[PDB]
Amino acid sequence: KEPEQLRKLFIGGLSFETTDESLRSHFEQWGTLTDCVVMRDPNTKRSRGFGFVTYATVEEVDAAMNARPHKVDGRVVEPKRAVSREDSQRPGAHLTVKKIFVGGIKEDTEEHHLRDYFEQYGKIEVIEIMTDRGSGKKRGFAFVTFDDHDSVDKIVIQKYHTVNGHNCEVRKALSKQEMASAS
DNA sequence: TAGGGTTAGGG
């Protein structure tokens, strides 16, 4: 058994009439659901337009994500890896992005180093090992852009990432302005 | 379209 958090998917854009039962009825087509629920307003009991489905195994979760697009109750919904309550606190933790910031990479880090660790998550579109525009010095971080936002999500939910022999920190890439707006 | 009475004691 893997952690509950890694076996759970967030399902956004739920139709106004989607219920625990209709949600379950759709996603069970890809595996055993150990949990399924539509978040509602504790007051009006009105649906908040989002929910969560949790499979018995991450393998089933991967099958579901490979089954996109998902149309539930006549509405195309938006499934995403479930981000923990703790991480949902960080700026832009719920953004749909295809690029990741990789910080703490050794000076002698080359692109092949990044590929040997990251390709396992999805198709890589661009790899950028950052250097100072002027001195040519290596700055110790890179940007890796994927073909699918789910690749990035599968990555940021894990804790450790080993590149060029040592762990590195991976975050969703925030724009220059999003960086400022967060600072 | 970010969570369900689900987050810092008392010694």
Side-chain angles (χ1 to χ4, degrees):
Chain A
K1 287 291 289 304
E2 38 261 302
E4 182 257 349
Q5 193 66 237
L6 293 182
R7 296 183 290 102
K8 180 170 54 173
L9 283 177
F10 162 88
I11 311 294
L14 246 42
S15 165
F16 67 80
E17 74 179 313
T18 295
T19 187
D20 292 10
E21 293 291 50
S22 56
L23 192 58
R24 170 178 290 283
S25 171
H26 174 84
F27 289 108
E28 289 194 312
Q29 296 178 297
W30 292 280
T32 298
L33 290 183
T34 58
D35 192 10
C36 188
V37 57
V38 178
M39 268 46 232
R40 296 197 163 75
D41 188 66
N43 209 56
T44 65
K45 293 297 176 180
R46 203 305 215 195
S47 168
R48 284 183 58 193
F50 78 83
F52 297 86
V53 293
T54 300
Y55 290 105
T57 67
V58 304
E59 194 194 316
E60 297 177 299
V61 176
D62 292 329
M65 290 307 279
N66 294 329
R68 286 168 290 163
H70 284 279
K71 181 171 162 296
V72 183
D73 287 313
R75 171 77 150 66
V76 182
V77 299
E78 183 168 37
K80 312 170 189 179
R81 303 288 166 162
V83 179
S84 71
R85 290 164 168 70
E86 180 195 318
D87 292 343
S88 295
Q89 228 60 193
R90 298 273 61 182
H94 301 152
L95 301 178
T96 301
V97 296
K98 294 165 179 289
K99 183 200 288 187
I100 52 171
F101 166 93
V102 183
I105 49 180
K106 305 206 308 166
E107 294 288 284
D108 73 339
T109 289
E110 280 164 31
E111 296 199 333
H112 69 276
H113 291 309
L114 290 164
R115 285 182 180 287
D116 282 3
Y117 175 74
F118 289 117
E119 295 201 340
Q120 285 191 176
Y121 293 89
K123 172 61 182 298
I124 297 178
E125 289 304 320
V126 192
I127 295 177
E128 300 166 280
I129 297 187
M130 308 311 284
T131 60
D132 180 281
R133 32 121 63 66
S135 72
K137 295 280 199 172
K138 244 65 178 175
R139 303 188 59 192
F141 70 92
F143 287 111
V144 180
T145 304
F146 293 83
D147 202 31
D148 178 8
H149 78 69
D150 186 52
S151 291
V152 171
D153 297 329
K154 280 186 298 183
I155 293 172
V156 299
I157 51 179
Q158 302 284 161
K159 188 170 182 72
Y160 303 120
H161 303 294
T162 311
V163 171
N164 189 11
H166 305 290
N167 186 257
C168 58
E169 203 185 317
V170 179
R171 280 121 64 179
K172 281 186 172 178
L174 293 177
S175 79
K176 179 203 302 174
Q177 283 179 28
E178 288 178 307
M179 281 303 294
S181 187
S183 296

